[PDB]
Design a protein around this nucleic acid. Structure first.
Ligand SMILES: Nc1ncnc2c1ncn2[C@@H]1O[C@H](COP(=O)(O)CP(=O)(O)OP(=O)(O)O)[C@@H](O)[C@H]1O
Ligand SMILES: Nc1nc2c(ncn2[C@@H]2O[C@H](COP(=O)(O)O)[C@@H](O)[C@H]2O)c(=O)[nH]1
Ligand SMILES: Nc1nc2c(ncn2[C@@H]2O[C@H](COP(=O)(O)O)[C@@H](O)[C@H]2O)c(=O)[nH]1
Ligand SMILES: [Mg+2]
Length: 443
RNA sequence: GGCGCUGCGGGGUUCGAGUCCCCGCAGGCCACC
C-alpha cells in the first residue's frame, strides 16, 4: 500500500462515473434552454461548473444576476418566481438568503438570486461573492479537479466536509483554494500536518503567515475568512488526520463510517462499568431549518453543562441529536448523588457587624470558625444531576435558545437508564463516551 | 437564529457583588448558495 496507489484506488470513490456526468449534462442543457427562453441574466457556478463535484453528489448551482438597485424584497420575489418557472419540482426553505431548491430531469438544482456587482468589495446579499469565486477559480483549477475531489472525499468520509452549523467543517470552495495553494491533495495533507490555530493562508498573496485565528483569506475579498465557521476542534481533527495518513496511509481514510447497532444491554454494562450518571433531556423539535436549530441545541447543551459544573455534578461531556420529531440533549456526570449538606464561607471573625448578620440566619446546624473565618452548613435544593436539570430547565427555559427554550417550556422530560437506550441516541452515546469498536466502514 | 469586548442599568444569590446567575440598554460576523 504505497501512498501513490492508495490515491488511485481512492479516485474510484470520488470521481463520478459516466451515467452521472451525462445526467448532469442533460439537466444543464435543459436548464440553459429554460433560462434562455426567459431572457434573464444567469451564470452556472459551484462544483458543477468547475467539474469538482463528488461521485454520488451531483447538484447544479445556477445564479441569477439582478440589478444592484433592487431591494432585498424585489430580489426575493423575482428570484423565487424564476426558480419555480425553471424547475420541474421545487421546495423553498432557507434561513436568510432566499433561493429555490428543486429538480430538473432527475438532477438537483439550486436557483439563487444575487446582485450583479462590479467588484465584490462591499456586498449587498450574502451570496454576492460566488460569481467572483467562479471567475477567480475557473482558470486556476484546470487539471486539478481530481485533487479537489480527493480532498472533499477525504473530509466527507471523516465527517468534516461542509461549513454549515451542523458540521462546522471545510466548505467546498475552501477545498478548491487549498488545492490551488498547495498544488495537490498530497501536498495539502503534508503541509496541513503543521497548521496551528494561528495559521493564515493568503492564496492571493501566495503566502502563509500567522494571525490571531485560523484564517483563509478569500482571494476575492481580503476581509473574508473562508474558514470562518471551521471550528477549532475540526481544524484539530483534520490536522491529526493528515498526520495519521502520512504515517500509515490507507484507503480506509476515504471510506465513510456508519454507526453499529448497540444492544441496550451492552450500553447498560458500559454505563455500569463507568459508574456515571447518563441522562437526556427530550423535547419536541421546533419546525425550523437546521441552520437555526443546531446553534440553539449547542447553546442549550452548554447552558445545562455549565449549570452542572457549578452545582458540582462534575459533568464529563455533552452531546445532542435531532430526530424527525424530538431533540435530545445528552449528558454524562461523574456524580450520581451528592450530599445535601455543603459549606458556605462567612466573614472574618474581626468585624462583628457582618459576623452578627451571618449568624442571625437560622440553620439546622451550628456555624464554626476555621482559619480565621466563619463558615456555615447549608442544605442543597437537589442532590442528583437529574433533579437539578429538571429544576433548571423548568425555570431557565428562556435562556436555552429562542425556539428550543420555547419548546422546552411546553414539554420536556428527563430520561435515563435503559429507557434512554431505547431512544435513537446510541451513536451519540457511543461517541460521547468514547466507546471502542461502535462504527464500521463495512459496505 | 447563533455568536462581541467593554460601559450603563434592573433583578436574583450572598454577611458582603465590579466579580456568580438572569434580563434590558448603548458603543458587526457566521450558517442557509
Ligand atoms: N459557506 C460558504 N463559504 C464560501 N463560499 C460559499 C459558501 N457556500 C457557498 N459558497 C459559494 O457558492 C458555491 C456553491 O456552494 P455549494 O453548492 O453549497 C458547495 P459546492 O462549492 O458547489 O461544492 P459541493 O457541491 O461539492 O459541496 C461555492 O463554490 C462557493 O463559491
Ligand atoms: N464582609 C466581607 N468582606 C470580605 C469578605 N472577603 C473579602 N472581603 C472584603 O472584600 C474586599 C474585596 O475587594 C477585600 O478588601 C475584603 O476586605 C467576606 O467574606 N466578607
Ligand atoms: N458579595 C458577594 N461576593 C462574592 C460572593 N462569592 C464570591 N464573591 C466575591 O469573591 C471575591 C473574592 O475576593 P476577596 O474579596 O476574597 O479578595 C470578593 O471580591 C467577592 O465580591 C458572594 O456570594 N457574595
Ligand atoms: Mg453545488
Amino acid at each position: 500500500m504505497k501512498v501513490e496507489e492508495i490515491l488511485e484506488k481512492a479516485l474510484e470513490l470520488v470521481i463520478p462515473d459516466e451515467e452521472e456526468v451525462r445526467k448532469g449534462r442533460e439537466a444543464e442543457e435543459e436548464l440553459r434552454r429554460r433560462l434562455d427562453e426567459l431572457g434573464v441574466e444567469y451564470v452556472f457556478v459551484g462544483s458543477y461548473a468547475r467539474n469538482t463535484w463528488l461521485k454520488g453528489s451531483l447538484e447544479i448551482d445556477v445564479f441569477l444576476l439582478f440589478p444592484e438597485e433592487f431591494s432585498k424584497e424585489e430580489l426575493r420575489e423575482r428570484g423565487l418566481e424564476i426558480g419555480k418557472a425553471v424547475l420541474d419540482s421545487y421546495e423553498i426553505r432557507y434561513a436568510e438568503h432566499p433561493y429555490v431548491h428543486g429538480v430538473v430531469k432527475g438532477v438537483e438544482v439550486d436557483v439563487v438570486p444575487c446582485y450583479k456587482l462590479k467588484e465584490p468589495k462591499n456586498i449587498k446579499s450574502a451570496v454576492d461573492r460566488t460569481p467572483f469565486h467562479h471567475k477567480w477559480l475557473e482558470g486556476r483549477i484546470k487539471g486539478k479537479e481530481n485533487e479537489v475531489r480527493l480532498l472533499k472525499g477525504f473530509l466527507k468520509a471523516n465527517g468534516i466536509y461542509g461549513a454549515e452549523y451542523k458540521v462546522r467543517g471545510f466548505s467546498g470552495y475552501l477545498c478548491e483554494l487549498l488545492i490551488v495553494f498547495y498544488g495537490s491533495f498530497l501536498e495539502t495533507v503534508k503541509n496541513a500536518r503543521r497548521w496551528t490555530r494561528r495559521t493564515v493562508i493568503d492564496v492571493a498573496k501566495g503566502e502563509v503567515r500567522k494571525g490571531e485565528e485560523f484564517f483563509v483569506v478569500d482571494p476575492v475579498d481580503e476581509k473574508r475568512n473562508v474558514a470562518a465557521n471551521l471550528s477549532l476542534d475540526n481544524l484539530a481533527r483534520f490536522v491529526h488526520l493528515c498526520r495519521e495518513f502520512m504515517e500509515a496511509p490507507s484507503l480506509g481514510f476515504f471510506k465513510p463510517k456508519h454507526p453499529l447497532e448497540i444492544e441496550p444491554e451492552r450500553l447498560r454494562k458500559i454505563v455500569e462499568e463507568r459508574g456515571t450518571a447518563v441522562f437526556a433531556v427530550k423535547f419536541r423539535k421546533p419546525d425550523i431549518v437546521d441552520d437555526n436549530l443546531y446553534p440553539q441545541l449547542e447553546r442549550a447543551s452548554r447552558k445545562i453543562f455549565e449549570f452542572l459544573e457549578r452545582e458540582n455534578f462534575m459533568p464529563l461531556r455533552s452531546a445532542f441529536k435531532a430526530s424527525e420529531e424530538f431533540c435530545y440533549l445528552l449528558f454524562e456526570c461523574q456524580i450520581k448523588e451528592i450530599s445535601r449538606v455543603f459549606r458556605r464561607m462567612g466573614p472574618q471573625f474581626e468585624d462583628e457587624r457582618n459576623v452578627k448578620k451571618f449568624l442571625s440566619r437560622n440553620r439546622a446546624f451550628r456555624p464554626f470558625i476555621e482559619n480565621g473565618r466563619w463558615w456555615a452548613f447549608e442544605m442543597r435544593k437537589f442532590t442528583t444531576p437529574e433533579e437539578g436539570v429538571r429544576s433548571y430547565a423548568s425555570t431557565h427555559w428562556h435562556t436555552l435558545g429562542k425556539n428550543v427554550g420555547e419548546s422546552i417550556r411546553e414539554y420536556f422530560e428527563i430520561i435515563s437508564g435503559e429507557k434512554l437506550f431505547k431512544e435513537p441516541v446510541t451513536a451519540e452515546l457511543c461517541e460521547m463516551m468514547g466507546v471502542k469498536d461502535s462504527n464500521s466502514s463495512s459496505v
